[PDB]
Every structure is written in structure tokens, then in C-alpha cells.
Amino acid sequence: DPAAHLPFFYGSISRAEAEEHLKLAGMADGLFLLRQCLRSLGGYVLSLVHDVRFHHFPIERQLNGTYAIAGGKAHCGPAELCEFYSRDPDGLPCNLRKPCNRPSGLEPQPGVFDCLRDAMVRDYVRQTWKLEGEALEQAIISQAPQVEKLIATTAHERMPWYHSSLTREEAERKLYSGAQTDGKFLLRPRKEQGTYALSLIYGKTVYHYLISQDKAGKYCIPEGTKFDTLWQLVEYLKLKADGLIYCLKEACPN
């Protein structure tokens, strides 16, 4: 990760954890930290304090490898972006003053998605090129970036909560037939390609939410947060309801 060496990069942490660190640091204006985006591939989130209030700016990695905040100037990397904004606010509520450096003994938190994608890329390369040992190791380094998107967009298909073929009726039959604990969910594809449904049980009642991908290829429940992959959507909604009646808890297996 291009930002792993930055003392103010916290890795894959939540907004809550990020705000906790900024609070414990004094809540000074311009105080900021960088964390890995939980919604996009290779993105970051700039978290800063101003007027005793938190501001979170998602940083997207452009196709050409640069990084930029929505409507902002692109930069060749996360460090250069923070350096630029230290000098010129250029749209932010205030310039970046004083990085919230990681406390001694605290390292950046590894992302679960990155960790799982590693295994998947290895397996894909091994099955396709029939390589092993150092040979496999060299190949994964050479192929990883090229097959990255492919593995990420299809990662959901390997998760327990994904059901390749379930109608609304069958989905309800599975959710109702069990412990019926709040947050029990499953993801299923719909007839029209590009659309899926999130079905969860809350208060002995099953809710179904439509998920569709826009022209940009991003997924979302109508009027909701957008994600690069279905895996990220589900994982995000496990942390916060973000509009849902209740957040995702237990996965309803195969």
C-alpha cells in the first residue's frame, strides 16, 4: 500500500475509530489522518477536524493511477495529496495542519478485503498458469494488478452469504426457517443482470432491498452509498445500517 509508510495512515479502520483518535489528540483545527477506503478499490479517506467538527473526504484512485478528492486536483499519490493540501486548502474547510500520527506501538490496520483478495489472486494464478513455488510468487507479482478488478468484483461468489440461485420466496423460506435472529441476511442475484437483492430478517419480518449497478459500474441500494464491489457493500453494511432497517449480522449460509 503506497500509504503504509505514512505515520498518519491508520489503514483499514472505521469512521468511528478514526474520530476516536482525532478526539484523543486534542481536536485541533487542521488535525488530520488518512485511512483506507472501505468502499472503493485502492481509495483512501482523509479525515480532518475543523471547528470541533469532523470532515471525511473520500479519495478515489483514478484509472491513470492518480488520486483525487471529488472535484479536486489529481495527485500522483496519497502523500503528495496531503502535502498539497497543507499549503493550499483548495476547497477544504481549512488547510491540513498537524498530522495525527499513529501512537507508538500502533501500526496500520490490515484490511480484510485485501487479505482475502491475496488468497484469491494466488489461487487464480496457480490454476491458470499451473505454477508453484518461487515461479508462482513471481507470476502473482506480475499478474496481480491485471487480474485485480476481476478477482475483486467476483469475490462475493465465494462468501457463505451469497446464494447463486434463490427466488424471493425461497429466500424468505430460508430466513424464516431458523433462529430468526435480527440481522440474519443473504444476498441473491435477480433475473435482470446487474440487479441483486439483499434480504434480511428483523423483528420476525423479512426486508428486501434492491441493489443495482450504475453506468460507472458502482453498486448501490437506490439513493444509498456506492461501492466498487458487492463484497464491500455487504461488509460496510455490517458496520453501519446506512439506511437499512438494521445492520447485517449473521450470514444465512448456502
Binding site: 469512521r15 479517506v45 470532515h55 471525511h56 473526504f57 473520500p58 478528492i69 471529488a70 472535484g71 479536486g72 483548495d90 476547497g91 477544504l92 424471493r168 437483492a197 426486508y207 428486501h208 432491498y209 434492491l210 441500494i221 437506490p222 439513493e223 444509498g224 452509498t225 453501519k240 445500517a241 446506512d242 439506511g243 437499512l244 432497517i245
Partner: peptide, 19 residues
């Protein structure tokens, strides 16, 4: 299409953008 539930827009997580 069918009877799908809507998001309670009042509980959505807000992200900032440049002004």
C-alpha cells in the same frame, strides 16, 4: 421488480465534498 424496502435517508452516512 416487486415490493422492495426503501432506505431511511435520515440515517445515511454523510461524506464531505469540496466547495
Amino acid at each position: 421488480n416487486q415490493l422492495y424496502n426503501e432506505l431511511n435517508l435520515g440515517r445515511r452516512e454523510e461524506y464531505d465534498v469540496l466547495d
